[PDB]
Structure 1
Amino acid sequence: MNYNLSKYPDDVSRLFKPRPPLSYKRPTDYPYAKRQTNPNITGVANLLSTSLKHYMEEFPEGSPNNHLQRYEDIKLSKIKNAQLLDRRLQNPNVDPHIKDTDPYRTIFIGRLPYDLDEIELQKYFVKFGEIEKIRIVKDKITQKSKGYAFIVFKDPISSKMAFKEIGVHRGIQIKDRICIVDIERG
């Protein structure tokens, strides 16, 4: 070609020779102006709603949506989950096991090793003031140590200094586990 308005020089531009012009062929589809989807869509007639009864008498009972019952199984199971939780929330001023002296004196300790003892618990927590009581909590259904305890100090300032120190300090290492501390919460 002569002009070649391209980045390349004249040799490289003449190298991309195009195949000669496309032969013309008289078109077979519809012209772009005339193109349209089917118009004159006769609406859902009264005569159609009159001929529904031939269909309705034939299939009067529809088939059961059993794939919906897989969803009605799960959603109703989640509501029954709340009712077992509702059975628990009615049952802390009762438990006997949390019903010694002032709740402002009570530390929660949690994540304690399953294989701690109250004497090692007492050692660590007696670091922050004289103890009035301990109790590790154990599963009443079979006495797996639950991994929490409640520790009543002679003063709430020593209970909150024990809290300070041995929970926000990453969790007090006792035996081999990292033991959160909180106040009673409950």
Structure 2
Amino acid sequence: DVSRLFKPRPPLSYKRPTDYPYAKRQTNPNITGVANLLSTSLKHYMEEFPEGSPNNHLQRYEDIKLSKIKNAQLLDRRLHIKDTDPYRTIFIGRLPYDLDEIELQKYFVKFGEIEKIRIVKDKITQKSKGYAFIVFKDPISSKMAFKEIGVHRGIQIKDRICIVDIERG
């Protein structure tokens, strides 16, 4: 009963092949040359289609390429906050967009004396771009306040998270 169940079928009958032998199998040989067409038929083809149809799907490709080559040089094209050196002056970042200069001055005065404050806003609209420059009366106090406001999950911005660091100027 080991192999009494896997009894194979009877041997397959023989039929004379209807295809070509493995030795005679080939694709088309004697493929004629391409030079003869160029002399005669090419002239007729060029005469009967003067101009080809426009290549339109490349328009979108080159158009988006134009965006890439158009964004960069235009951002590079360019050239209240011109205070003293930032050794004693403090800087803030990521402040609220709808914030003001007096509120920023008060927030900076919460942890250090302020001598000169002037917030630089975007030129497009009169809204605080989130940058406030505060001159401090003590560089050590300003550095300590910046460290505290950076380690304490960011200073309290009105509608954002305002991390603080050096002015880096």
Question: Quick one: distance in 2 between partners of 1:107 and 1:42?
Answer: 83
Structure 1 spans left out of the alignment, 5+ residues: 1-10, 90-96
Deviation string, structure 1 residues 75-134 (Cα, Å, up to 9, x no partner): 223333234324334xxxxxxx21112134444322223454545534553465432233
- Measure, in 1, the Cα distance between the counterparts of 2:20 and 2:90: 85
Report the Cα distance in structure 1 between the residues aligned to 2:90 and 2:22, rounded to whole angstroms: 82
Residue number among 126, 145, 150 corresponding to 1:167 in the alignment: 150
8 Å CA contact 1:129, 1:158 repeated in 2: yes
Matched, 1:112 2:95: yes
User: Secondary structure at the residue paired with 1:15?
Assistant: coil
Report the CA distance shift for 1:21/1:157 in structure 2 as closer, same or farther (over 3 A).
farther
Match of 1:122 among 105, 120, 126: 105
Q: 1:29, CA displacement in angstroms? A: 1.8
Gaps of 5+ in 2: none
Q: 1:66: Cα distance to partner?
A: 1.6
Deviations 1:134-158 (CA, angstroms, capped at 9, x unpaired): 3334333323332232222234444
Determine helix, strand or coil for the equivalent of 1:145: coil
1:24-49 CA-to-partner distances (Å, cap 9, x unmatched) read 22222222222222222223215534
Determine the C-alpha separation between the residues in 1 that align with 2:63 and 2:107.
49
- Output one character per residue of 1:30-72: Cα deviation in whole Å (capped at 9) or x when no partner: 2222222222222321553443211112222122112112222
> Percent identity between the aligned chains?
100
Taking the aligned partners of 1:24 and 1:33, their CA distance within structure 2 comes to: 21
Q: How many residues align?
A: 169
Q: Could you say which structure has the higher strand fraction?
A: 1
Which ranges of 4 or more aligned residues in structure 1 deviate by more than 4 Å?
115-120
